[PDB]
C-alpha cells in the first residue's frame, strides 16, 4: 500500500512531463513555470507560486463516478488554508473512463454535495482541522490519539444531523479555488511522448535513456534555485537546450521504470566503456542512507571488485576506490574490518581528518608476486571531499538515491548517475553478479 | 624561392588565424569580417572590403631597420589606384623582435624618404607605372622586354637627379591611406593559439586536427559567397558554430605547413586509431586538379591499402573505398589499371553512373581462402554523389587540400585532411609505406 503522499508526488512528476512535453511540441515561447513546495513546508517564500502539482488517481471501471474523488480533495481544500495565505490553487488532472473533457465547474451546490461524504477517516484526518467542532469531547478524543466504533458512531452522528458551520469563508473556497480536467494516459502516453521526441537525428535507445531524462531533470531544476527570476524562458531558451549540445549532457539523474526487471539500466551496459580498459580510476560516490545495510557489508563488496578487475597485474596499473558519506566517525567500526577476509585497503580517512596522498596515489604494481600492496580502498563522500574530480578523475562516477553533488568542478566527468535501493543491484549492475 | 603572391596568401592566413583565435576569445558579437579578392583580378564588384591583407616579412636579426619593407609596400601603393577605384585599404601586420608597437604615423615626409628606394627591381617592376617618364625612350625599353646595365643605369639616373612629378594626388595617397602595425612572432604564435584553442573539453589532439581546421575553413568560407549579406555575424551564431555541434563540423582543409621533415606531421599517428579495429570504414577524397602524378598511381594505392587494412581474414570485417572527383568517364579509364594484379574493386559509377545499393555492399571475408569477395570499392563525386554518411558512414572522412564539400549529412564522420602532391605521402601519412 504505497502512501498517497507518493502517488501525489507522481501525479506531480507526471504532470511536469506533461508540460515538458508541451514545451518541446510548442518549439516557442511557453508560460512561466515555477515549483511549488507542497511536499513538505520548506516555506521558500516565494508568492509566484500557481502550479501547486497534487492531483491523484483511483480505480476507475466505466464512465464517471461521484466517489471516484477521495481525502486528496479535501487534503487541497484543507492546504488552501496556508498560514501565510498564498495562492496554491490546486488541480486535478486525471481521466473517466467515458466523461465529457473539460472543468468541472465551480457551482456550490455540487460541491457542497460532495463534501457530504460522511466517512470517518476523512472527518478525523483533514476536515476535523476545517470545522472547529463546538463539543471539545470530539477535539479531545481527536488528539487522544484513541478512539473506538462508539466514538466514530457519535462523531458521524452530529457531523451528520447536527452539522456544525465551518469558520472559513464559504463563498472563496467554493468558487475561486480548485480546477478539475482530464489527464493523459501516461501508461500509453509513454509511447506518444517517445515518438514526438524522435523528430530529429537522435538515436534509438539514446532518447529513451539519455535525452528524455535529461530534459526532466532540466525542467524539474529550473525553478529550485532561491532566485525567482530563473523561472523565465523565451523561445530563443528552449531552442537553444533543445539542440544546444545534447551529445552527453552531462546526465545527472536516471532510472526510469521502463525495463526495471529487477534490475536497474542505461548504466549497465554503458559502464563497459571506461571500465574494461586496465589504465582507468573509476570511483562510486553513494550514501548508507538510501542503502538498506551498512555496518559489515560493503567490504565483501569490494571483494568482487578487488580481483577481478585489477587482476592480470600484466595488464592494470590503477586501483579501484569507493566513495559513500556514511559519518566522521561511524565508518570507524569497519575500521576493525577491512584487513578480515584478506583483502589489503585503506580507509583514507582515518579519524577527523580527509588525507588527500593516499587518495589520489597510483599503487606500484608487480607482475611475478601475484600481490599488490592495496587492490583498492574505501572511502567518504563527506563536505569536504571533492578528489572525483581533480587528478585521477573517477572515470566510472555513480550516485545513488541523493547525495551531496553540489560545490563540484563539473568539469569533463562522465557522471552516470544510478540510483538504487542496495549494493546487490549494483553488483548485478557492472556484470559482476549473475542476477539480483 | 617561394612566389610573394604565395608568401601573401601564407600571411593572408595566418592572420584569419588570429581572427579566428579572437572570435574563439571573445564569443560576442564583433566586427564584419569580409575576405579580400586581392589574389587575382577576379572583380567581384564589391566595395565592402576593409582588411585587404597582403602583408609578407623577411629575414629579422634586431629590431627594425628603414630597409625592413621591401616591394610589397609599392605592390601596395599601386593597388591603391585600380580602374575603378575600389575601396581597397591594405593593412600590414609585420612583426619585429623588441620594438615600440604602433602606427607608422601618416606623415608625408616619412613615406617621402621610403619611397626614394632607388632599386632597379622596384623602378622597372611597379615603380615605373607611378610615373609616366616624360622620356618615351624609357617606356620603350620597359615595354621592349630587354634592357641592358647601361638603360638601367640611365634610368636610375633620370629618376634620381631628374626625379619626375607623379600624375596620382600626392597628399591623399601617403596621408588618407595606408595603415601600418606592429605584429607577433608568428613561429612561436602559433604554440599560444592551439593552447587558447583547448579550452573546453575537446581532447588532446581533436582540437589541433578537427576543431581547428574547421574554424579556420568556416571563417574563410564565410564570406565566398557572391552575396555581400553573408557576412553579418552575430553572438548567437557565433555561440552556435561554437558549441552547437562541433563533432564533425564537415571540414574541408587541414593544416597547410608546421614542423615537418619533408612530411606532414601531427595527423600522421591520430590516424592510426579507429582504423586498427575491424569495423572502420573511413573512406577518402582527392582531385587530380592538385594531385599532379594521379594518372594511375593511385591503381597501386589500391593494392598497397588492400594488404594492409584489409587483409588477416580471421580478424578484419569491413572494407575501407575512396570516393574521389576524377571525371565521369576518365574513372572507366582508370579502370583498365584497376583489374590487373587480381584486385577486384568496384567503380563506383560502374561505368559512369554512380549507384547507390551496390557501393555499400558488405564484403563476405572467407577465411580458408585468406581472400575476399571484393578486396576493395571505390567512387567519383559528381553533384549528385552523396554516399560517404549513408551507410557504414565513413567515421574518418578524408580530405586533401579541399574538394566539393556540398550536400553533406555531416553525421559522426569526422574529418581530416592530408594535403599532398602524390601517392608516397599519402602512404607514408596513413602509415603503410616506411619514408616519404
Not at 90 to 103: C, I, S, T
Not at 182 to 192: D, H, R, T, V
Not at 284 to 310: A, G, H, M, R
Request: glycine share 2%.
Amino acid at each position: 500500500m504505497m502512501s498517497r503522499e507518493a502517488d501525489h508526488t507522481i501525479k506531480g512528476f507526471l504532470y511536469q512531463f506533461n508540460k515538458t512535453l508541451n514545451s518541446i511540441l510548442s518549439s516557442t515561447d511557453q508560460d512561466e513555470i515555477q515549483i511549488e513546495g507542497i511536499i513538505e513546508d520548506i516555506d521558500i517564500k516565494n508568492s509566484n507560486i500557481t502550479n501547486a502539482i497534487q492531483c491523484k488517481y483511483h480505480e476507475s471501471k466505466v464512465r464517471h463516478n461521484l466517489s471516484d474523488i477521495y481525502k486528496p480533495i479535501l487534503q487541497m481544500l484543507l492546504h488552501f488554508l496556508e498560514n501565510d495565505s498564498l495562492n496554491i490553487k490546486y488541480a486535478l488532472y486525471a481521466y473517466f473512463p467515458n466523461e465529457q473533457v473539460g472543468v468541472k465547474e465551480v457551482t456550490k451546490s455540487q460541491i457542497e454535495e460532495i463534501l457530504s461524504s460522511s466517512n470517518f477517516d476523512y472527518i478525523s484526518k483533514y476536515i476535523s482541522k476545517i470545522k472547529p467542532p463546538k463539543e471539545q469531547i470530539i477535539k479531545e478524543l481527536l488528539g487522544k490519539t484513541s478512539k473506538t466504533t462508539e466514538d466514530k458512531t457519535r462523531i458521524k452522528k452530529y457531523y451528520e444531523t447536527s452539522k456544525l458551520e465551518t469558520i472559513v469563508d464559504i463563498d472563496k473556497f467554493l468558487r475561486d479555488h480548485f480546477v478539475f480536467e482530464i489527464g493523459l494516459s501516461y501508461e500509453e502516453l509513454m509511447n506518444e511522448t517517445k515518438n514526438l521526441l524522435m523528430k530529429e537525428g537522435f538515436s534509438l535507445e539514446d532518447v529513451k535513456d539519455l535525452f528524455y531524462p535529461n530534459s526532466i531533470q532540466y525542467i524539474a531544476e529550473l525553478s529550485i534555485l532561491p532566485e525567482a527570476e530563473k523561472r523565465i524562458s523565451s523561445k530563443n531558451k528552449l531552442i537553444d537546450y533543445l539542440k544546444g549540445n545534447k551529445k552527453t549532457a552531462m546526465s545527472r539523474w536516471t532510472s526510469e521504470v521502463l525495463t526495471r526487471k529487477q534490475l536497474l539500466k542505461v548504466r549497465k551496459n554503458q559502464l563497459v566503456p571506461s571500465l574494461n580498459i586496465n589504465s582507468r580510476s573509476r570511483y562510486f560516490i553513494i550514501d548508507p542512507d538510501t542503502i538498506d545495510n551498512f555496518d559489515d557489508e560493503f567490504i565483501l563488496f569490494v571483494k568482487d571488485y578487488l580481483d577481478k578487475y585489477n587482476s592480470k597485474i600484466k595488464l592494470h596499473t590503477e586501483t579501484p576506490c569507493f566513495i559513500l558519506k556514511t559519518d566522521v566517525n561511524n565508518l570507524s567500526e569497519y575500521h576493525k574490518r577491512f584487513v578480515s577476509r584478506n583483502i589489503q585497503i585503506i580507509t583514507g580517512y582515518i579519524g577527523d581528518t580527509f588525507y588527500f596522498k593516499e587518495f589520489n596515489k597510483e599503487p606500484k604494481r608487480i607482475i611475478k608476486d601475484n600481490w599488490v600492496e592495496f587492490k583498492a580502498r574505501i572511502s567518504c563522500n563527506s563536505d569536504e571531499v571533492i578528489k572525483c574530480i581533480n587528478y585521477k578523475k573517477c572515470d566510472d562516477l555513480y550516485i545513488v538515491g541523493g547525495v551531496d553533488v553540489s560545490l563540484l568542478d563539473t568539469a569533463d566527468v562522465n557522471i552516470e548517475n544510478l540510483e538504487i535501493n542496495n549494493f546487490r543491484e549494483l553488483k548485478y549492475l557492472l556484470s559482476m553478479l549473475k542476477e539480483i
